[PDB]
Amino acid sequence: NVDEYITQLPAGANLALMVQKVGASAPAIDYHSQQMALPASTQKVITALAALIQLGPDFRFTTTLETKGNVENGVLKGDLVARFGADPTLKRQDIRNMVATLKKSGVNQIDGNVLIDTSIFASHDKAPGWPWNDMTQCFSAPPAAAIVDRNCFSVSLYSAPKPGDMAFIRVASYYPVTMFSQVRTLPRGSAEAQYCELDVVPGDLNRFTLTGCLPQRSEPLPLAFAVQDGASYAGAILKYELKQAGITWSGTLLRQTQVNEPGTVVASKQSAPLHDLLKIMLKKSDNMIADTVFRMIGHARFNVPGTWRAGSDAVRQILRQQAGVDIGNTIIADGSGLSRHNLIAPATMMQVLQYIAQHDNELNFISMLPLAGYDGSLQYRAGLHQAGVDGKVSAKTGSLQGVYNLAGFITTASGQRMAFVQYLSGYAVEPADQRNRRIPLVRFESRLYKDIYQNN
Numbered sequence: 001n002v003d004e005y006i007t008q009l010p011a012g013a014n015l016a017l018m019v020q021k022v023g024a025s026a027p028a029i030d031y032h033s034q035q036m037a038l039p040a041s042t043q044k045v046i047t048a049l050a051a052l053i054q055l056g057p058d059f060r061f062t063t064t065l066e067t068k069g070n071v072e073n074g075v076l077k078g079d080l081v082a083r084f085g086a087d088p089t090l091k092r093q094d095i096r097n098m099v100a101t102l103k104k105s106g107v108n109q110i111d112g113n114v115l116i117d118t119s120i121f122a123s124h125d126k127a128p129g130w131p132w133n134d135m136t137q138c139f140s141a142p143p144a145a146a147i148v149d150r151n152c153f154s155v156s157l158y159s160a161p162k163p164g165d166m167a168f169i170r171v172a173s174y175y176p177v178t179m180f181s182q183v184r185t186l187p188r189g190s191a192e193a194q195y196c197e198l199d200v201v202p203g204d205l206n207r208f209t210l211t212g213c214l215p216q217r218s219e220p221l222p223l224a225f226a227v228q229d230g231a232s233y234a235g236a237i238l239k240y241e242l243k244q245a246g247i248t249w250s251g252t253l254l255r256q257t258q259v260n261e262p263g264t265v266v267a268s269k270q271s272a273p274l275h276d277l278l279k280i281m282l283k284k285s286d287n288m289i290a291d292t293v294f295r296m297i298g299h300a301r302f303n304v305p306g307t308w309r310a311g312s313d314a315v316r317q318i319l320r321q322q323a324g325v326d327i328g329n330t331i332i333a334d335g336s337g338l339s340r341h342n343l344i345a346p347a348t349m350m351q352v353l354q355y356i357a358q359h360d361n362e363l364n365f366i367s368m369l370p371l372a373g374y375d376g377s378l379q380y381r382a383g384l385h386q387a388g389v390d391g392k393v394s395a396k397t398g399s400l401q402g403v404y405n406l407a408g409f410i411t412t413a414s415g416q417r418m419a420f421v422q423y424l425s426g427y428a429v430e431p432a433d434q435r436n437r438r439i440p441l442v443r444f445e446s447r448l449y450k451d452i453y454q455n456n
């Protein structure tokens with residue numbers, strides 16, 4: 001009763017839907033299944049499959065400290081290279097530990113430069129089609145080769161006691177960022193409060209200026225922002241940890257972007273295995289893991305510094321050549337599904353899902369998807385709960401402004417496992433219905449998935 005369920009949805013919402021028994025060649029439900037749509041975070045299903053095929057479940061991201069030169073009486077005569085590898089889980093502590101290892105190895109002083117090497121990747125750290133306005137948000141932090149603590153930092157914004165005075169910013173001292181406030185404090189119930197925005201404006205070298213207005217508040221406003229220049233940020237963290245460990249140097253911090261032969265590895269950190277990281281990625285919809293993996297796929301397949309284009313080409317090739325899926329006119333722009341350039345039909349995603357199901361004993365893939373009513377993004381999915389399908393749906397969600405997708409597997413009343421793709425976009429509610437905007441979605445899903453479960 002798809003057309004009927006559609007009437008639950010806001011005016012003019014666009015659904016493309018396909019439901020098909022695992023291993024079958026004809027769908028049970030086909031509603032605009034050939035139509036292209038924005039996949040949002042369901043793109044991560046493709047990223048995970050191509051990643052397992054190209055890199056394997058035991059791949060680890062790695063970061064090293066390398067020396068180029070001889071060490072004479074504790075002095076490195078040459079450069080220290082910190083070679084980053086797009087590990088999305090690297091932490092400040094890891095940098096601190098690698099420096100401790102460097103110190104313990106006998107290096108007290110560097111007669112030379114400190115190089116922040118990001119040559120594993122090239123070109124922009126932002127995928128084509130990502131909205132500019134989200135670039136300062138942590139969910140869209142540029143997934144650079146140099147990541148520390150997810151390239152996200154937090155700040156506290158305090159209103160001035162005196163209306164009219166500048167709001168002021170508190171930030172922890174260890175974050176190598178530079179904050180400026182041009183934020184005017186407003187009285188509690190100002191009319192100027194209506195159209196005066198509070199904005200963040202990023203500058204070079206991880207400078208951020210806050211502008212606009214802030215109404216007086218009793219508690220400081222917590223804000224979190226994305227680092228725009230990972231290389232500089234990681235360099236500053238490295239500089240701080242070197243100084244704390246008493247290692248001095250004569251040169252400066254420089255970027256090394258061109259491919260080069262590695263020095264001797266004196267310290268290293270490897271991530272958890274790729275299967276573990278893909279699990280986090282699929283359970284929680286981790287954009288940063290998805291996108292670091294995506295550019296790593298292209299680097300590994302083509303032996304070139306990883307770029308968005310190389311990743312797109314690689315994923316297409318892997319799907320066709322290793323999984324037997326020709327994605328045709330599909331557009332793959334990134335790994336996370338954030339890009340509004342991504343475009344794929346349910347019927348194409350269905351081929352991917354059918355491949356995964358067929359090879360699931362090899363891939364151990366379906367166990368990584370959120371299980372409705374249990375974990376990940378589906379722990380609390382109201383539509384699926386009310387449908388009676390908790391514990392019976394393993395599926396990847398995808399959500400952007402106006403896009404509410406699901407893609408995965410359902411075990412039905414008969415025990416038949418079915419793959420399904422729900423691509424719902426163009427979803428918008430009347431301006432006076434905003435913080436209720438999700439009830440039509442919930443009503444739609446409750447009915448749809450009960451139907452699928454009960455009738456198959």
Ligand SMILES: *C(=O)[C@@H](NC(=O)Cc1ccccc1)[C@@H]1N[C@@H](C(=O)O)C(C)(C)S1
Pocket residue numbers: 040041042139284285287336337338377396397398399400401
């Ligand atoms: C993929 O769809 C991702 N979407 C976004 O990051 C956009 C977004 C949405 C809401 C708040 C902030 C940013 C991830 N997938 C969705 C999803 O699976 O529904 C999440 C909300 C889990 S983020």
